[PDB]
Structures are given as C-alpha cells and as structure tokens.
Amino acid sequence: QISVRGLAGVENVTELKKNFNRHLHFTLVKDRNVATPRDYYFALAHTVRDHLVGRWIRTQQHYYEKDPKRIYYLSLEFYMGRTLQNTMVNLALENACDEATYQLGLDMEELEEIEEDAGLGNGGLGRLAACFLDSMATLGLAAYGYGIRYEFGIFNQKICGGWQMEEADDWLRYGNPWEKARPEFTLPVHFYGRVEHTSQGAKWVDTQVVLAMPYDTPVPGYRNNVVNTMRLWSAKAPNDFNLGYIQAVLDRNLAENISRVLYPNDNFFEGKELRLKQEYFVVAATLQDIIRRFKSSKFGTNFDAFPDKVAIQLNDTHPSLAIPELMRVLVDLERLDWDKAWEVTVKTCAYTNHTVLPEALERWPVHLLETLLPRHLQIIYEINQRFLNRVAAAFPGDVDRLRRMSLVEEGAVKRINMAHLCIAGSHAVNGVARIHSEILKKTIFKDFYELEPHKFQNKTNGITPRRWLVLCNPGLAEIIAERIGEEYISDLDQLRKLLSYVDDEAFIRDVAKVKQENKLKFAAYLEREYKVHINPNSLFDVQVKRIHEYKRQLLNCLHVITLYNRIKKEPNKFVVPRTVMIGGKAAPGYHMAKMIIKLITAIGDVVNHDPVVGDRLRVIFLENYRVSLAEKVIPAADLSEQISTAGTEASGTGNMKFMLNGALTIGTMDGANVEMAEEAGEENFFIFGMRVEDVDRLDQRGYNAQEYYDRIPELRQIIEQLSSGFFSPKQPDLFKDIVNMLMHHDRFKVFADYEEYVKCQERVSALYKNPREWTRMVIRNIATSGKFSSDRTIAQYAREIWGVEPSRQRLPA
Template sequence: MNRITSQNIETFLLQNYGKSIKTASTIELYNAVSRVALGCVADKMYSNSGKKRAGYLSAEYLVGRVIYANLYNMGEIDTVRKILEEKGIDLEKFEEIEDLALGNGGLGRLAACFLDSAATCSIPLDGYGIRYRYGLFKQSLVDGFQTEGADDWQRFGDPWSIRREEDVVEIVFGDQEVKAVPYDMPIIGYGGDMVNTLRLWQSEPKVPFDFIAFNDEKYSDAVKEKNRAEDISRILYPKDDTYEGKKLRLKQQYLFSSASLQDIVRKLKRAGRSPKDIGEYYSLQLNDTHPVVAIPELIRILVEEEELSFSTALKIAEKVFAYTNHTIMPEALEKWDVKLFKAVLPKVYPYVRKINSSLKNQLKKLNIPQEELKKYSIIEDNKIFMARMAIYATHSINGVAQIHTEILKNTALPEWYKIYPQRFNNKTNGITQRRWLALANQELSSLISTKIGEGWITDLSQLKALEKLKGDEEFLHQLREVKQLKKNQLAAYIEKNEGIKIDTSFIFDVQIKRLHEYKRQLLNAFSILDTYYGIKEGRIKDFKPTVYIFGAKAAPGYFRAKGIIKLINEISRLIREDPVVNKFMQVVFISNYNVSYAEKIVPAADISEQISTAGTEASGTGNMKLMLNGALTIGTYDGANVEIVQQAGEENNYIFGARVEDIAEIEASYNPSALIEKNPRLKVVVEALIDGTLRDEGTEMFQELYDSITEGASWHKPDHYYLMLDFIDYCDTRLRANQDFKDPRLIAEKSLMNIANAGSFSSDRTIKQYAEEIWQLGNK
C-alpha cells in the first residue's frame, strides 16, 4: 500500500485548488486528504482473488463520517495528524464535514459495521445499496417540535467515491426506463491488507435533457424525465402513505436489487463463467425485506436472458440467497399491493406468481392441510408478502439475537419453522470495536491497551483479561477518570451545538436510538415525570442528580413519535423552570442525532436505556456500543439485552419488566386504564398529558398520546407496548441504580465487568459466522 505524504497532499491541493495546506479551507483539505488516501488503496478495491464472494444487499448504510475510520484502518491517522499539526491545523477540524447518513438506525449501522469487519477479517464481502442524493433528513428542534430539512451530504463533494461509468446498467419499470450508475467506496480492513467495495447505485435518466422541448419553450418538459429518474434515488424512505409514495419505494428497492444482480452476472461473464453457476461464486444476503424483490428478478434474468428453466432458476436462487429478519412486528414485514406491483414491475410479477405456485405444490407434497395454506401463501388477499417469499426461496433465515430467533421459530413464524427447521439460525448482531472504542474513546482504548496489549482491536474476546483488574484500585480510579473526561468532552460539545449547559457531576442517563413507540421513549419520559413529582413531594429523598440525554429522529409522517419528542422537550422545560427540582434533574434532547453525535455520547454515558417491550427489539446494537464503553444497562429482557446480562452478569446491570411469556399470559385481559386508576403515581403522570401541566401548543399531540394508552389509536389496542404494565418496576429500578451511583467504586466495578465481557458482541465474530455458516465461503 502506498503511503500518505505531505508532498502528495500539497500536490493535490495545488493541482485542484491552487492552494497549499496552510491556505486551503477545511473542505479543500478534507477532499485532498481523502483523495490521496483513496489513491493509496484504490488498486486493492478491484483485485479479485478468485474466491467465492458474498454480497450484502441493504437499503441502508449508516456509515457516518468516514475519514477517521479509513485513516485509522490504513494505519495513517497519526501520519496525517502530524502533517497537519506541522502546518498548525488540527485533524479534528474534519468534524465539520457532514456524516454519510444513508440509513435510519440500527439496520444501516449494522451494515456498515459488517463491511468493516469483513475487510478486517479478510472476508470477500461487497455491499450494494442506493446512493441517495440526500440523507435521512436534518433534524431541528423548534419550540420543542421536530422539524425536518434536507441532509445535503454531497454539498462538500464526495471524495471517497469513484463513479464507474463503464458499469452502468439499465432498469426497466412499467412506466419508465432509467440508468443505474454505480459509485464505489473503499471498505478498508484494519491494517489495510484487504479493501472491499461498497457499490451504491444512483438513478439517472437515459436522456437527461429534451433539447426540442426546451427550444419549443416547454422548459419544465425538457427536464421532466431527468427529475423523474433522479427522484428514485433522491431520499431514503420517501413517505409512502399514498399510491405514488409506495410506487417510489418499490422502484427504489428494484433499482438497487436489479442493478446489483445485473452487475454480478456481467462480472461472471467477463470472468468466463456461466451465470447458471452463480451459486458457486456468490452468496447474497438480503438485509431485511427491502431487497427481497431480488429473488424473482434473479429468476427472471436466468430464465429470460440465460434460457434456464424456471425450476432450475428457482433452485439457483435458493442457493444464492439468504435472508436476515430484523423484526417480528407484522407492520414492518413488507407487503405490496398486487395491482401496484404489476404496474411498476410487469416483467417481474409473473415470476412472483410462479414462485407462489411452486410453494403451493411443495406444501401439498408436505401434506399441509388446505385450510392452513393461506398463512404460507406469497400472494394472498391481493397482496404480495415479501417475508414469505424470502423464507421460501432462500436457504437460510437468521434472527439477530438469541431471544429474537427463538421468537421467530416458536411464535412469529412457527409454521415455517415446522417445515424448514434446518433453514433457521441465529446470528447475534455485533459492532466494530475499531469505530466504537478505538476511535470513539481513545482514552479508554489507550488505558486498556496499556493493561492487556492491543490484540483486542482485532480480537475483542481479549477484553476478558480485564476481569483480573476488578480489585485493582488504581485501574478502577483510572476508569472513573476516563469516564469523567468523556463526560466533560460531551458537555462541551452539547454546549457548543445546542447552547445547553450540563453539570458533569450529574449521572449521564442516555437513550439514543430511532424514535419509535416500541422503543418506549414515552416510558422514559413518564418515569422522569414520576421522579420529578417524587422529589417535589418529598417521596424521593437523597437523589443523586441526573441528566437525561435523548437523541432520536421520528419519521416525518409519524405523528405520535413527533408528539413524544415534543413531550420530552416539555418535561425538560417543566424541570428547567422549577428551582426546587432543577438542582437534581435535567433533560436534554439533542438535535440531529447521527453517528458522529453517537461517537461523543456513547463513551460519556453512565446509564444505557434499553427499555423496549419484551419481544419487540430484534437485537439492538446501541446497547452493545454503550456496554463496550462501560455504561450500565437499564433494560428489559429483550433483544441482545438478554445476552448482555448473560455475559456481564445481571448483578452488573439493571433488568426490569414483564418478559415475553408474562405478556403472552396477560395479553387478552390487559386493561391499562385499570392500572392507571389503581396507582396514583401512574395516574398523575398520564393525566399530565391532558390536565394542562404540559403544553402541546394546540396540536392535540398529547391528547393523542393519552388516547393511544387509554383507548387505543389507529391499529393499536390500548397501551399496545405495555408502558403501564412496566411503569412502577421501571421507576423503582431506576431509583435503585441511582442509589448505587453514590458508591463510585461499586459503579466502576460494574462498568469494568461490562467492558471485560463485551467481547462476544464484536461484528468480527458475527461476520465470521455468516461467512462460515451461511455463505460457506471458500476458494473457487
């Protein structure tokens, strides 16, 4: 690998901007360093070893700011820091550059971690997705309400991507034909030995400008097709509560699925291999249901372009594809209206029908009773069930945490597990320690390395050696010092970005994740209100001051989630304006939460809130990041929380609430209103939504939240996520943790035990399991 030097940075700046390192702007310097670094690894991006490769098909890649991770993995971060320091420039200036936020949450961040781990572990894995023109959205808080703006991540350029014009493919829809143009980003493994590729497709028109229409003064018509084509890859998850919105989403999914398959088939042919042997050379992982349309598309390509029989093509698809399920919630398992699907993808729909017919024939051979066929059917009630197609036409279905996989097998998909038990398997999610410890918390990683060496950077299980330091007073003191330093740094960052001052002697209690009802930010808010009233009433005494930090975005059309954001900000105002309580409590909702913000918050957190309703969070990865950095989990027995407490010990965390089996037992008779009437603490916090204590500025948001709990709303039954059921146990568990924080040594020991037992949550472990147990990668 070539090295980065001061000279080649200077040369790039001179040739492109006519400037030197000292005179270049931050953006120009960022572009120069990035392009020079890319030049050092570009040759490795396209060196195919001849081994069987895997492809990761995902609608999301929540990459974050790439420059630091890439320089770190290349072993060049200290070199670049020194080059810049000699010119009086701080490497941290690059924090001004926007995140690459082509994802919504854990699904997209997991994809990014997997790519990093695969390259580090010498696993040939390429990512495929969409190069959205704008990221998710830029969130602002105005009077406590979320407002959205365009996340124009490309406005400073995109120096880490290479446009590959020679690999353009055509995509045909029922009403439109477009070009899919690939942009390749390097995925650099730690040490720089392996460089895989993330190929993102951008939708562009076949004819970008209608000259005749323009000359006829039809100016809008002249660029109509350009705009229509570019709309397809303009934003992640366009609003889909209308026909046109659903149509656009389906086009997005087909764009990157079809383009990726066409690309792979073409590569096989260029290498002198037959597409019918694609299963010998590629394994393709479907990250949730978004890319499942790839199944009938591959079959279509093999039948129509390679002249294989349908039955042969179906067998090939089954060998090629594997499916990761990320949710058990029915509303998140995609279904497409048949009429819409046929209109958008008329050439693909016949193959969906053939797959469905093949399934029915197989079910008959398995003697499945006629009355049970409906729950398997891929096409039913004028809808296409994508998860069912994924289960039938792949060779592997994996859950992403032990409890999630058991729920899939026993509760969510038991009929499928009954006929295909060998296909179901678990791959507990993971995170890359290089991003989430080595880079995000350099002080802690340095301390760890002085005690056990640097082997943990590529083998996180080595953290287990830290357990022997549990009684080491000096080390425990150093752990506390690092945590305090990270809290100070976060407080300074929040003051700079939000204009809010935080007392760093407070406990930092953190809930950072996508805003969704099942993640129960509302339960957190109610609990904070309970503590507020408890302190005012004198019921809660000797309370250790706490700042509650939230970071979350609500989908633009998700009214109830937006109401929760407003509620949290109203509770913040209530506490801030109360001189009796504001000495003990503070609530901070940070704006525009993203990967870079997470890199500041995660190392500073004392408490990690993982409070989803048992049985709803497939895994979670934020819980792993916070654990790795020494935060203590307050959580339900849900997702990867189960494995976290198995590894680190329940005594070193705080578990509360109903479990899956408890909820199943009371589900039919559950009456949240009776619980509210019976418990004064519950009643006062819920009534605060409508009694004037909290203000929603006439939007009726708080009334709607109240109704969703007491009466049910939209498709919800009352208190669909059992906030009232878990409320008292949650509040009391939080108070127990609060009292424990009065003993700094005890907390340092608990923190150490979490760090030392985080080894199994490395995405290196997870991706090796995918490679060995699902993809069966080997020399070809």
C-alpha cells in the first residue's frame, strides 16, 4: 500500500506464502481447518524469523573475523514490546508479508495483535535499553544486550471497581518464537560461602551454585543486514542439588526463583535479598561470558588490551556489582595485582544515572552483602579505603568530605552506596539530559565532580524512529517521505527540511488528516476492546507514564475538576471539547499511587455521566499501559502532558514520542522538555510553572500549601469537593489521604504550579479553535524532533565514552 513499507515483488510473496504453509504444517502441526489466528501469527513469526538467521550468523561471523571493540550493555530491564512488525520493518518485509498474508486470506494487522509484549521492564529505563539496542544495530556496533529472562514481566493491570488489580504476566505461555535457548553455554554462578586466605591470596569457598542458562534473541539493524544479540540469563538448579528425595527435587525451585519475576518498582529502591541475587546473577554470568569471549578471540593472558576490546555500560546502579566482580576475577582468579586490575576495571566500565530522587538510590545493607557475597564486600571495603586516601590527599583536613564521599554509609544499619561505587570504578558518568547532568555536578555528586571533573558527561536520551514513527505511525511516515524521501528514518535530523513546508497548504491538510485518522482508529479501538465511547472531534489530552507523585497526575486531576466546575457554573457557554486520557501502572506496594488511580476513575464516574456536560468533557483511565498500548495512543494524541515538578524527571522519553507523532506539549522546564523547547522554539511549546531555581527558593522559605488554598477560590472548591465526598458519595472520606498529603506533606508542590498550569491550558484550548495554526505549530515540532533520535544518543556514547566509530554501511545479504 505505502512506499516506506518496502517492495511486494512476485518472487518474495510466493516464497513467503510457501514457508508460511510449511511452518503451519510441520512446525505447528495444524491445517487450515483447525488453525486459529494464534496459529496464523506463529506461522508468520516463524517465517519472518527464518529471514534473520542467515544475517544473524554472518553478523556474528563478521565480528569474529574483524574482532572489533565489543559493547556490553548491562541492564536488568529490556522493555522490548512486540517483535514481529519491528522485524518486518527493519528487514523491508512489511509489504511483502502484507501481500502474502492477504493472498492467503488473512489480515496481517489482526495477526500482529496476537503477539504478547515482551514486558521485561517497568518504564523509561527499560524502554531506553530497547531503543538503544535497535540504534546500536542500526549503527553497525558490535553490541550485546545482557539481562535476565524473567518468566513473568511487568504485571497486567486490571481495573476493578476503579482499583488496580495485578495479575501475572505469563508472556511465555504459548512460547516465544524469537528466542533461541543455548543450554550448551550454561555457566555457574556462586552465592554465600566464606572467604579463605592463603599464600596465593583469597579464595571464595563453600558456595552455593546456581546455573545461568542463556537465551539469545536477534536484534536487527535498520536495513543494513546487521543482526546483533540480546542474551538473557535464566536460572537453573544444578543436578546434584540437595542430592528426602522428592523434597530435594522440589526444592530446585528455590534456585530457579532468581529469574522468575521482574520487580515492579519504577524509580524506587527495595532492599530485598531476591533482588540482590538477581543483580549478582546477571553480573556474574555476563562477566564470565565477556571474559571467555575476550580470551577466545583473533587478538589474544594480556589484560592490558581488555579495555581496548571491551566496553561495559551500566544502565543505572542495578549491575553495579560488575565493578567488584571484575576486580574479583582479575585479582583472585587471574592473579593480576590490585593496581593493574583496577586500572583495567575503570577503563572498562561506565555508569549512566537515571534519577536524583533519594528513594530511588540503591543502598544495600552491609549484613546482606556479608552473607550473600562475602568476597565482594571485602573488595568494596578495599576500593573504598584506596578511594578515600585519594580524597584525603586532594582535600587535606576536609573530614566531612570523607564521610560524604564514602561508599560505606554509617548509621544504625551500615549500607553500601552503589552510586558512589559506580563513580569510583567508572571512567565515565553521564546523566540523561542536559539539566539532569548539571544537577548531578551541582548537587548530589558535587564532591565527586570536584575530585574528577573529567568523568562527568551528558548524553541526552533518545527514542528509536523505527518503532516510534515508521512502525506505529505509517501514515505520517508516508506523507513525510513523499516530500523529503526515506533517508530520514536512519538520519532524523533531515526532518528539518519539513520547515519549508510549514506554509504548504497540501502538507498542512495531510498532517491534520493523518492525526484525524489516528484519532478515529483509536476511538474505534476503545469501543471494540473496552466498550467505551469517545468523541473523536475533541482534543485528545493524554498523560501516559508510570503513576508517581513526582509525575504529578494529581495536577492533571485538578485541572480536569476545574474544567468540570466551570462547565457546571456556566453550562451554556462554549468550551473546546476534550477527551482527557490518563494511563499508567502503579507499583503494587505504592499506596498513594493506587489512590490516584482511584481518584481518576472516581472523577470519570461523575464527569462522564453528567448530562449537562454532554460530549464536552470525558475522563478515561487507560488500563494496562505498556509498549504496544503506547504505539496506539501516542499517534492519536493532540496534547502531551509532561508536568513533573522541575528537577525531578531526569529526562523522560515519552515526551519525545509525542513530539515525533504530532502532539503539542504542555510541560514544565524539566528533563528533556528544556531541550525540546530549545529545538522547536519556546513559542511552539506550552511551558508553564516553576523553574528549578523557583523550587529551591520555595524550599528555603518553606512550602506552605495553605497559602494557595486561601488565595485561590477555584482550588479551595476542589479541595472541599474531595473532602466532603463529592467524588465518593458512598464513602465520603475515601480521599482523606490525598487531601492530607496535598495540604501538609506535598514534596512535589502540586498547588504551587496550579494557577500557571490552568492559565496555560486555556492558551492550549484557544489555539485548538484555530486548526490551521495548531497544525502549523505541530509541523514546527515534528520538524525539530531530530535530535531526540537514539541514533544521535548512541553515536555520542560510541564516540565520547566507548571509543568506537558508528557505521551506516551494509553487510552483504
């Protein structure tokens, strides 16, 4: 149908149809008489997977011959989503498969809906890992993603009586056609035991062994025939495990629980032992694999060359144990002296920080590490001692600096600060947006920055234009390609060329037409899947992201109620109709986040069934927000809500997805919003609220929520409604916690941004009344979204941290 989806040429279509039928028959053991859409999905998935393997094998062949520097991206989360359409796109197979499936009497889009999300992440951090893998393959880097194959990913969210229910995400039930089990490359991981000292140094003995089994998933580059590997470790009991007899066999489960389930916490630390085991598990298996690969190369005994052959990137502090683990292997097993092992470690490792929120920082109780990893604690103490000697020598007499910079935190319970560990043992530390990187240098890591200024960098986050434009928004990609060609897909800066079309009447019409189609499709999705009715002519006001206080879903809630109260005051006045959509998961133990979800639904219960309101205001909670739901709602959005308190959202990536897909952004000067507004021009953005400086000023003076309550009658009315049970008639005091928090213990100053936010929202409504000017502003956003491609981000990592050159060159097919 459309150009950007590739050629559907007779020879390919015929070959695809016959391999489809081969897989249906031989692989699935079905025929057309019994086959369900699921069977049809699998036959297609197997047919497409076949196209990868040749490229996969020769890519890995190429790296063996050329022996380039290898990039190892260590993350506990890879939020991949669906793989079918992404593979077709990157392989140029999408039209051919559409044709082949059409001719077999099947709708490919219906088949795509059957694939489970690989939901092995929580949100931003996990999805960044996924975008990174795509870009690394697209840029020809010899890169590997290493993580854990969780049996259960992020929970499926069900709304019941307005409340979140969690159910297990059993994503492997029907199988995963993309992975290849590699039991032959299984590796032992050690836990517990004790440390023995000898003439030949320390020995870690009497350990419990857990086996790590790798599963490989292909990662295709965009149209370059590069297929990299994501290797995920699964936990297996050894066969002499416990070995009355029955119980010993049943207790094998204990070892295998390590890889059972993803911890569902977004930006929040929980000091649980199982979590620490997961962290060491991925680190120990990966490092052995890295070293084995280093030794078995065309180059090489000599660990001097290690940093020239290996880069290890730590996605947050979750794989921070890679630092003492690498030291352990180099010192205890390879017999290098401390100072040489340490130079190698620092030159190999690099650390990316994702948040400044104190409750998100990993600080592990010493007594946990003592029991679980006795050798690693010793190495940590020794790293600390030598590091503190460097601080003492640089800042003599500064005793408070010493306690501030220590990796060991003193208190009732002694803790290891994992972020401090990462800084000390990495040659590079980066934040994920310019303002976030500055905040690190000025506040939380100020001391470390004064010691080693050269270590600190910025790498502003990015999103992949393949998944986040071509895949999810084919209509928009097509109208862009008509004017400027296809090269922008792997060089997103080229979208600037679209600025010379901002006054083009045909393009304006097309941009606005694609948005309307997207909105109509999504409104249909809501009716068919969730039996909910929305007006596709209203402004689609969308806030989708994890439910957190700092993300201020509550600020949005306050606006929504203001609009309702204004309508009820002046019913016969014209207002721009809105559909307000809020979506996101709450961590299971996060009580406040669960309350906010209930409020949102409770608001919808009042607003959606008020006859006076009509179709002018709708409030919808988007259930089970995840990657494949994002691919649908983002192209359909008019307004992107990015309203975190200034200085709390390190970067955001949702913000970029919306910019790329033709929504306008209302937001604070937080995270990457600042860089986005800078790229588009502040006139093309709806910026409101306190800057970082204003927050600090308010903190010094003290934040008093009562002040705003007293001076803003519209705010008072809302609080009285919440308190008196207007939104919960059966349980009048249901929302006492929310009101209490807002009035007395609001860390995120919801009320302080209320007035500016509401006023700015009026300016949004005003612009929406003039479709031509709205669309021209939209075009100005899309055209300047180029910088926020993860290809740019990854090229910066490659050049400034890893010391490798990106390549756009094809491998032979």
